[model samples]
Target: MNSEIELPVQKQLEAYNARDIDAFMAWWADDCQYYAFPATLLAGNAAEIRVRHIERFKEPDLYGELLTRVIVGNVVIDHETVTRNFPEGKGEVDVACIYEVENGRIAKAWFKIGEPRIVSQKS
Candidate 1:
């Protein structure tokens, strides 16, 4: 909505909840980089990040809910609850995400996930 860098953090969360990949990617810089926990996934650019997220949506039960956010200068941090349907019935994960903005877009991000627990325990 607003082109200010901090606005993207809120916009991205809304886009993510709506499962709108294009809208989410719009907030990312062309050369964006992302590091996921366990170091299993490292996306070098916005396109790669978009593709990976879209693939996750193929599972039909993957979703994330933003719990809170804090912004300081060009950095935005979000705490969220993530749910995914794996071979197991369902799993919930708490995550903390730090995003760095440049030129009004997200240029880099680091995400760390907590232990997987049942959804009922998230609250």
Candidate 2:
């Protein structure tokens, strides 16, 4: 069966929001990498990435709220609103994610996270 490059990416979004760590990790390459802001290796490989998300999944309010998911060529880009609880308080962060997929799995992902926007603040 043939799969679209965005297939795994879509599954990633579903699985992540479901807080299913293993299922989410399954869509990633064995050598998958995660970058923070870009050029900073936040996670070296799949195992590393998995562990990070596992911790995130434990957060009671944690969820990758997808505002938009776009496909441009072989990459799937996501604009997400993430809820982060820093013990002091929880805030929302806007993120732009670019995923590079190959062989039906994500080989690398770069995340550009903006400054946190307090959830209670509004226009």
Candidate 3:
């Protein structure tokens, strides 16, 4: 994979970790599409993507951590863990994400999240 493809993925991961919505969305194409698994939310176009993600992040306890990343051609794959804090404590799930790039931005993405599991109480 070329650095062109890898760099955007790295930036996206960093943005996600920092919960920087603007930075996270900057890598997306104007007509980007995204399919979020489990929740089955399909966001088409940049406006939809932004709206849906903003809603998803409304919960201050929500966060994600990237575990692995791989790039091949215009595709980037990420393995990550998503966590949510609640009165019951924290819950987490493993997730796999695939991104397709076009015109130096993410044109499409798909995500699959594992079943929820209890997370260890650690920083």
Candidate 4:
């Protein structure tokens, strides 16, 4: 895999786990497009991306655990288990993250998130 493509994706994942918006945005282009897989647009640019994550960063247990990664040309696809704070309670979800790298930055990205499974305290 090309470092140019992999580095940004890897770095973003690191920042995401740290919940550092500044460091996370560093790997994305100013005009990057974010989507919810297929063709559903989530964020139109980096600023929008930052706005969306600001609230998400508030989660004390927010973390993304990468299960695997696949790089093809300039695209990076990652499968991860992400812990999030839901209205019900803390839970984990499977996510498919797809990134398009250009000039060492993410020009566009897509995410396919699976249903969250809340952890039971009874266990």
Candidate 5:
């Protein structure tokens, strides 16, 4: 069964994979909070989140391969294998993202990232 809570989260993931910053930001609330798992705040608002992704979107191979999606109430959790262009090289990492949806937009999000597995070294 598909929950409405998954809408914004799914839209954001699609936008992220397309590297469309505008589309990605559209699914997030103006006062949204982004954190690195438990409590470390990465972005305090939509503008801050936009700024962060602006740089990230420049990555040539950035893509999030969703492995699973789990929804609980207004929360949507996604387990993904993300491809990133790291300082050392291009690599993949396991990431778990938790999103809280409110008023059809993502109000808060938390990301838990695993160690990067560098596939091809940059030279």
Candidate 6:
């Protein structure tokens, strides 16, 4: 049961790394929700989350460097280094993500981001 809940999150990571939006979306529920750092409501639903990813996926350098993962019941936790293209700049930052899986699909996720070390300033 625990592994079942972790499976979708695991696959989501693979699909995200491979830049496969269809595969990534397959692991997420139609009503998926995402919360950003500091517990802010990021995306209230799956379509909104998908839209966010569509824009993010445009960044050729976007990828998560997995440091570790811990699973408990229906929750999947990941500690990773994430590279991103932000409006301010671009850099790799540490992030902790928690995912809740329901019915074999990701239903909700939360992220806690660490201070970033700017690698490039394109402003």
Q: Would you list the C-alpha lDDT of every candidate in the order shown?
A: 0.80, 0.82, 0.79, 0.86, 0.84, 0.82
What would you estimate as the lDDT of candidate 1?
A: 0.80
List, residue by residue over 1-123, the lDDT tens digit for candidate 2.
335677878888888779877778888899988998858998878999989888888888887889988887778888998887754456778888889988888989988986787745644
lDDT of 1 by residue, 22-120 (tens): 888998998899998855547889999889788776766677888888887788888887887645546867799889998888989889987787745
Give the 10-residue window scoring lowest on summed lDDT in candidate 3: 114-123
Candidate 3 lDDT over 9-110, as tens digits, reads 788777676777787788888888888875464887878877777776787767778888888899988988887765656777778888899888988888
TM-score of 5: 0.85
lDDT of 2 at 6: 72
TM-score list, all predictions: 0.84, 0.88, 0.83, 0.87, 0.85, 0.85
State which candidate has the highest lDDT. 4
**Best of the candidates, TM-score:** 2
Which scores better on lDDT, 3 or 6? 6
**Candidate 3 lDDT score relative to the true structure:** 0.79
lDDT, candidate 6, 1-123, per-residue tens? 487887787877877768888877888889888999777888878888877888878989989889899998889888887887666666778888899998888889898987785665322
For residue 119, model 2's alpha carbon misses the true position, in angstroms, by 3.2
Candidate 4 least-lDDT 10 residues: 114-123
lDDT of 4 by residue, 1-123 (tens): 588998888877888888778878988999999998567998989999888888887888889999899999999888898987777777788898999989888999999886677777424
lDDT of 4 at 63: 90
Count the clashes in each prediction.
Answer: 0, 0, 0, 0, 0, 0
Q: How much is 6 displaced in model 4, in angstroms?
A: 0.7
**Residue 101 Cα positional deviation in candidate 4, in Å, after optimal superposition:** 0.6
